[PDB]
Structure 1
Amino acid sequence: AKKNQYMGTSVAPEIVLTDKGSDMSRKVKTEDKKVAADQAAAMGILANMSLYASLNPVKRMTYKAKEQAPAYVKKTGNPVEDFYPSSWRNMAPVISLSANRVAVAFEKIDAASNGVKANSNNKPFWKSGATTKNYVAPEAPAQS
């Protein structure tokens, strides 16, 4: 009885004005809609402010972030999987300036030179596999 029944239901009066200039065209419609948390357009706000505050020289000091722990990834022993995992393999920021736009982007970038591409080790599994019967070389003794 003390708490109103209407708080967490996220409804709100949406007002729409229609006007075509004439007198018989000027309705106002104050109907009720449950508004929804728009998931996709928050990434146009959360990411752009995360790179607004990345490039502030004097809001990276007097607004210092906390010490975030990394995730529950297990160290294997080879450093090319431990220090440079497959989720961050070959990722680098590319900055694309224009008129009144900074436009960084983090995407997987590579090579060219001679034909091949650097990666071709970790190709997708549909791209390679089962082409030929694959043999293996015997031990070539020593020599002197």
Structure 2
Amino acid sequence: AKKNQYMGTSVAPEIVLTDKGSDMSRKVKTEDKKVAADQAAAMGILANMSLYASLNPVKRMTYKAKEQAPAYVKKTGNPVEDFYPSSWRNMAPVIS
């Protein structure tokens, strides 16, 4: 009796305007449309803002970030696979 019917739908109006300098060309149209979530476009802004936050020194002290505990991986005793596993080994950052 009180729930918004379209709160969980992500449906928003699309507006398209056409204008080519002549009165016969001007036309506005509006149709509802589901707004999708781009998986790829968020990654670039996430990486760039993470790099910016990693380089900012004054946000480093005013916003002390929290430690994240690593995932469980079994140790094998030999240190070459304990400290430098193949998922990481020989990776190093280019600065351009």
TM-score by length of structure 1 reads 0.65
Give 2:14's aligned residue.
14
Question: How far did 1:67 drift?
Answer: 1.2
RMSD: 6.0
Give CA deviations for 1:9-59 in whole Å, capped at 9, x if unaligned.
000001011111111111111111101011100011111000010000100
Give 2:60's aligned residue.
60
Give the structure with higher Rg (CA): 1
Identity of counterpart residues, as a percentage? 100
> Which secondary structure state, in structure 2, belongs to the residue aligned with residue 12 of structure 1?
strand
Is the helix fraction higher in 1 or 2?
Answer: 2
CA distance in 2, matches of 1:78, 1:18: 68
Question: How far did 1:7 drift?
Answer: 0.4
Q: How many residues align?
A: 96
Q: Which has the higher contact order (CA 8 A, sep 6+)?
A: 2
Pairing of 1:1-144 with structure 2 (within 5 A): 1-95=1-95
TM-score by length of structure 2 reads 0.96
Moved over 4 A (4+): none
